[PDB]
Paper text:
In this paper, we describe an immature conformation of the portal protein found in the P22 procapsid, before genome packaging, that we named PC-portal. Nonetheless, we obtained small crystals of PC-portal protein core that yielded complete diffraction data to 3.30 Å resolution using a micro-focused X-ray beam. Instead, a phasing model generated from the cryo-EM density of PC-portal protein was sufficient to obtain initial phases and build an atomic model that after several cycles of manual building was refined to an Rwork/free of ∼29.5/31.5%, at 3.30 Å resolution. During refinement, it became apparent that PC-portal is profoundly asymmetric: the portal oligomer, which crystallizes in a tetragonal space group with a whole dodecamer in the asymmetric unit, could be refined only by gradually relaxing non-crystallographic symmetry (NCS) restraints that were omitted in the final stages of refinement. This asymmetry is particularly evident at the bottom of the DNA-channel, where the 12 subunits generated a quasi-5-fold surface. The PC-portal protein is less compact, having a noticeable increase in external diameter from 170 to ∼200 Å. Despite an increase in outer dimension, the diameter of the DNA channel decreases in the PC-portal from ∼40 Å to ∼25 Å, which is close to the diameter of hydrated double stranded DNA (dsDNA). In PC-portal protein, the trigger-loop is locked in an open conformation, possibly by making contacts with scaffolding protein5, while the hammer-loop rests folded preventing barrel extension and narrowing the DNA-binding channel to >25 Å. By pull-down assay, L-terminase associated with PC-portal protein (lane 9) but not with MV-portal (lane 9), suggesting only the procapsid intermediate of portal is competent for DNA-packaging.
Portal protein forms a channel for bidirectional passage of viral DNA, which can move in and out of the virus head and provides an attachment point for the tail apparatus in tailed bacteriophages. Packaging of viral genomes inside procapsids is powered by an ATP-dependent motor that assembles at the portal vertex. In P22, this motor consists of a large (L-) and small (S-) terminase subunit assembled in an oligomeric complex.
Residue numbers in the entry:
A (entry chain H): 9 to 593
B (entry chain I): 306 to 458
C (entry chain G): 408 to 593
D (entry chain I): 52 to 204
E (entry chain G): 306 to 356
F (entry chain G): 205 to 255
């Protein structure tokens, strides 16, 4: 027992229902169906109580505070790629759904229910090569985490452990034609799982035929720079290290080994986890970058798995009493045949037709003429009852007034700050931007190269080897028009797919933080006051000349770019991007 | 944050104040959820002969007449008997009023911390002063132990 | 029982001014507009081109010029010669292509999702829900306002941005109207 | 019978958790005039050229709640000195607080405040975590059958 | 944009609270409209010896 | 039609026409043998990266 790995250790999870069904499954149901469980003899005519939903919805809509719009972030360390022309990183991002709105349907239930993400087809789906940039991301669909219990979780979102844990959707049928994109598979994978029916099978859905796809599972790759010795012929030469130097360099003395990232290899045998079933026969898909990001929250409990947060259980048994008053009230009107009109109907009900027309002045039914009894008056003007008007339940629930609602508790304050933004803004912004796994520098398909170095110009490099002189621009010229006067046509350094690491490949700056930054946001957003921070002055107005243009991307107003830039003369302010305007003499 | 005299450090805490203090709430649970088993079982008792009839009585069939009664009774004479009282009632709703009010008052006390109109040297408290920086637990950037350095090339 | 009905009709209970009541239901709108466009413009098989993208008959005007001998250029002076749409020499590269096929022109020009207002000089002039008169002013801020209150563009008399700007004031040059030709003299 | 509805004590501390907004207290490396400010060329990039996008600012708060809930501890680290393609100075340290697992942990050493050298490192214990168990690959990997015996809570 | 449970599902309306949300207002309707026909002539009667 | 309910209208008179239901279109031009067997020489694509 080696290859088998974690599932035998994972059987204690999925064995049976135990307490992680009845207790947990209330997470997402509270908004739907009903409340009561064990209490005996529950009665009819109210089948959907709701009396949960008003709690969560509006406050789920109270998380909308997160546009956080600052873009095209320039790199302050050194030259970012292409500079002026690279502004379009967000090109396809902002247009449809994703972070702008679709986070609505994406996040959905987190505090109330389990949260995560769901499936995707391949990774980068756009067909046609072209000049522009591209951004494509996740598109999860439907609410498949209810019964899901998946354990490898000790830590956090960003952990370096097995990536995205394991991937299974509970049941998929349309997906039968969705994974048909592979090569001619026998189509019957026939898994056998036990989803408890308690042997009477209440619900009849038989769906089966599930698979799982991957190649590299927990691919373990470390620094491990040439650590071993040839002497004594030790086995287990597998490389290890912590810090590169330690012993420093024994090189110039001896021990020449020199092997770089070529390994005829054994890999960890956790395989398509199952006892007797494995395939692992020639399949390759990209590598695991896995931009798909299921999110998993945090709350208190001993350790391992959890009974996760919900706030509604204060009211549930404040609900039950609003349901039980209909057990004490609506039933008794049915328990009362309303009035039985007998005071001395000795003859019971005769002459039934006197109930036809219901007027009949001569009622009768009354004579006395009986055995020896005596005169015993009776005063049932209250009938016979011990009537109790619900005085107790009222105040019993008056202490529970706010506590049977007990929500929308947030955003209470006079005005401005100290308001309704709690950690859930930064935690669900952790559901947004906090993923470190996407980044930039990933090299898999060809998105990687920009100019590419042309993979040619070496053959043309001979011009600088030409003898005699080397001279810069002389002898005027007229028709030249646009720039790039080209004879040498020579550059330096190199151009390749990636920039390596922590040079040029950085992604997104700052963190959760201020909504105001260095680009020309003054403009139209001030709610209360207006101005007075920068009054007039003689240099002041020649300072504000270039400031206030709001263009972003306009059309009719673009003549701004001209400015005075023809002749720099006595201003020469920005010294801008494109030389094309300023280079004439 | 723990104070101690005896070798077992005892907490100093908030929520433990009212724990049993507001068991005064469970006294509504000690009546309607528990001893409600005193259930009314209200019987108008005057002339249903003996109470045991055929099942028709409490099933509420469309046949109206409820008459069970005929009387020639035991021999006493010239005297009534009055069942009127029947079973029980809700419990003396007075003395329970202020208990919950005191608990809730102690609760609105803990909502008073550094209370201001607003601003005016705002709401910094003990827990901020103690919790302000783990950056100063992270103070380390070679602050005492210096190792890593630029070293241009 | 009244306390039950008050719960369901509440969406984003708010005071006034900013911090609005937008819900996910509002976003059905551009789910519907996207339910239009990408069902149309995302496929252009035939008609973008007016007449077969030029009908490609006019290329026959290319007959004699590419011959290595000298080609006639440099009109002598001229005054009214500048008018648009004439064809004699016709120096132009290739021609426009229909449908989508290989190079650029496939899919372009959709909306910018965001708050209520737009900009064609609009959230410049927005104001509304936040007070009034947010525009700062300065001495040469009126050269920003030599555009003045011009708003609606193509209209008949808001057209002042073009004709009134068309000749005498070109020493400024901040304008960029839509006008086809101009040049000539004073 | 029917119990577990009580709860309802929570909101009192829900005000005490939400101060996090001011928890950042932004300040960055104020130099002095007694050192050499001419060496400040790198300083302006401290928050920039090494760690720039940083999630751990929320990890402070994970400790902030459990603080008022119970004691606040500290946990494991992965060395910030990383990766490949060596570069310039680029140093800032990190720690990410986890949730609890301090419950039955018993410490007697000092347990007040530590600015300076003090006791180095003494005791770390967790009951029924997983974490870096199967991740042993890059550390030692000989046998690891040791596994002391305790009375599990 | 709504929630989900399984497969595709019974539609959740805002009317799910309004079904019985009207509750027992209708019970005051029980004492008036047609049920006086159920009551046989509220009888003001005493000392009517007319046989 | 729940056969006990008195309602009159039965007949309908209108229809509709299906077009695409689980109908798969494929292009998948690349990556198979030039000469020797040409078995299943045309089939769908998985990764677009490189050969």
């Amino acid at each position: 027992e080696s290859i088998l790995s974690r599932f035998d250790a994972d059987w204690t999870a999925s064995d049976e229902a135990r307490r992680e069904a009845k207790n947990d499954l209330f997470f997402s149901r509270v908004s739907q169906w009903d409340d009561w469980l064990s209490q005996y003899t529950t009665l009819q005519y109210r089948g959907q109580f709701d009396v949960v939903r008003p709690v969560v919805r509006k406050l789920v809509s109270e998380m909308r505070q997160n546009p956080i719009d600052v873009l095209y972030r320039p790199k302050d360390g050194a030259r970012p790629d292409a500079a002026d022309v690279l502004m379009g990183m967000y090109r396809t991002d902002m247009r449809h759904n994703t972070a702008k709105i679709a986070v609505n349907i994406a996040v959905r239930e987190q505090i109330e229910a389990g949260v995560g993400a769901w499936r995707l087809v391949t990774d980068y789906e756009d067909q046609s090569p072209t000049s522009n940039n591209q951004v494509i991301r996740r598109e999860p669909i439907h609410s498949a985490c209810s019964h899901v219990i998946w354990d490898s979780n000790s830590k956090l979102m960003d952990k370096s452990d097995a990536r995205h844990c394991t991937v299974i959707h509970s049941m998929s049928q349309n997906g039968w034609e969705d994974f048909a994109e592979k090569y001619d598979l026998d189509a019957d994978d026939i898994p056998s799982f036990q989803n408890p029916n308690d042997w009477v099978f209440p619900w009849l859905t038989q769906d089966t035929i599930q698979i799982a796809e991957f190649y590299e599972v927990v691919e373990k790759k470390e620094t491990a720079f040439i650590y071993q010795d040839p002497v004594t012929g030790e086995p287990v030469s597998y490389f290890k290290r912590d810090i590169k130097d330690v012993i420093d360099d024994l090189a110039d003395s001896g021990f020449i080994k020199i092997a770089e990232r070529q390994i005829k290899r054994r890999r960890v045998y956790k395989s398509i986890i199952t006892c007797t079933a494995v395939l692992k026969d020639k399949q390759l898909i990209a590598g695991e970058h896995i931009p798909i990001v299921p999110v998993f929250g945090e709350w208190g409990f001993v350790e391992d798995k959890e009974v996760y947060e919900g706030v509604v259980r204060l009211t549930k048994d404040g609900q039950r009493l609003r349901n039980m008053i209909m057990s004490f009230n609506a039933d008794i009107v049915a328990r009362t045949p309303k009035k039985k009109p007998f005071f001395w109907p000795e003859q019971i009900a005769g002459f039934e037709h006197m109930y036809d027309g219901n007027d009949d002045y001569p009622y009768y039914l009354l004579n006395r003429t009986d055995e020896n009894s005596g005169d015993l008056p009776t005063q049932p003007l209250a009938y016979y009852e011990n009537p109790e008007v619900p005085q107790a339940n009222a105040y019993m629930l008056e202490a529970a007034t706010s506590a049977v609602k007990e929500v929308a508790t947030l955003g209470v304050d006079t005005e401005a700050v100290n308001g309704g933004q709690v950690a859930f803004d930064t935690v669900n912004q952790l559901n947004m931007r906090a993923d470190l796994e996407t980044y930039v520098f990933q090299d898999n398909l060809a998105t990687a190269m920009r100019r590419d170095g042309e993979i040619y110009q070496s053959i043309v490099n001979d011009i600088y080897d030409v003898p005699r002189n080397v001279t810069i621009t002389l002898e005027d010229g007229s028709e030249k028009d646009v720039q790039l006067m080209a004879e040498v046509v020579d550059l330096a350094t190199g151009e390749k797919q990636v920039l390596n690491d922590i040079r040029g490949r950085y992604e997104c700056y700052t963190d959760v933080g201020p909504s105001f930054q260095s680009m020309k946001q003054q403009n139209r957003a001030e709610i209360l006051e207006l101005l007075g921070k920068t009054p007039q002055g003689t240099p002041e107005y020649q300072l504000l000349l270039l400031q206030y243009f709001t263009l972003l991307d306009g059309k009719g107003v673009e003549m701004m770019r001209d400015y005075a830039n023809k002749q720099l003369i006595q201003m020469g302010v920005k010294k801008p991007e494109t030389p094309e305007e300023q280079q004439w003499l």
